[PDB]
Design a protein around this ligand. Structure first.
Ligand SMILES: *C/C=C(C)/C=C/C=C(C)/C=C/C1=C(C)CCCC1(C)C
Ligand SMILES: CCCCCCCCCCCC
Length: 227
């Protein structure tokens, strides 16, 4: 098939198979348990992205959805990816500031809504409805960013300065990265079609890798992961 965006997928596969491995060996070296599970979580988060990017590299998780008179190419392997990785990364932040069970259930439940409506909206055939789904989804995301920015950050201050200090950085990678996502969906292949597909995969690879591997390196690298 040799699609123009395969380059960026072959590239995604490589940066995540490589991140997954670095995490995995470093993780099996640690003896602390509190810190030990920040390592399993990251080995798993990179690993899921990895089988997905590669599988896509290989022509799976791609489907043609009709709308706007075209036969639009929708990569759904992305939502299977995000479905499991986004709630776990939120789990990374919740363990860190000692979240309640209630707040974690809520962040996860809303996260399920983000991706579920994201996917539905990306498989819709009526052009204006795609955008109703994109919108309930984004609203879910703003909600999660709200909690994190207002709730978690009130609570990262019951921690040590090294923990709040670390939470502020990861919290800042999240807010910046997670919010570009709805803007890319919408100007590219799933939304307006302004940005062609090789450039979309290229921007989703950079947010993905930044957000999983850039995130893991910063987290696993801090003193705060030792309870
Ligand atoms: C490793 C992947 C990460 C951190 C993915 C984050 C993904 C999002 C914040 C996705 C958001 C979306 C919307 C706000 C609306 C339209 C559809 C989505 C699912 C692309
Ligand atoms: C828990 C929230 C479930 C929300 C389902 C909303 C469906 C809205 C459909 C609007 C179609 C025009």
């Amino acid at each position: 098939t040799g699609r123009p965006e395969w380059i960026w997928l072959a590239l995604g596969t490589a940066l995540m198979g490589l991140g997954t491995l670095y995490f995995l060996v470093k993780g099996m070296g640690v003896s602390d348990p509190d810190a030990k599970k920040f390592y399993a979580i990251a080995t798993l988060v990179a690993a899921i992205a990895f089988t997905m990017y590669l599988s896509m590299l290989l022509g799976y998780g791609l489907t043609m959805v009709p709308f706007g008179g075209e036969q639009n190419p929708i990569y759904w392997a992305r939502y299977a990816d995000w479905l499991f990785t986004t709630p776990l990364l939120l789990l990374d932040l919740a363990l860190l500031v000692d979240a309640d069970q209630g707040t974690i259930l809520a962040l996860v439940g809303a996260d399920g809504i983000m991706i579920g409506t994201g996917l539905v909206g990306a498989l819709t055939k009526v052009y204006s409805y795609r955008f109703v789904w994109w919108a309930i989804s984004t609203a879910a995301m703003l909600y999660i960013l709200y909690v994190l920015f207002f709730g978690f950050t009130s609570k990262a201050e019951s921690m040590r300065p090294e923990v709040a200090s670390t939470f502020k950085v990861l919290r800042n990678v999240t807010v910046v990265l997670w919010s570009a996502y709805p803007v890319v969906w919408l100007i590219g292949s799933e939304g307006a079609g302004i940005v062609p597909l090789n450039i979309e995969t290229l921007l989703f690879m950079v947010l993905d890798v930044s957000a999983k591997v850039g995130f893991g390196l910063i987290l696993l690298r801090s003193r705060a992961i030792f309870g």
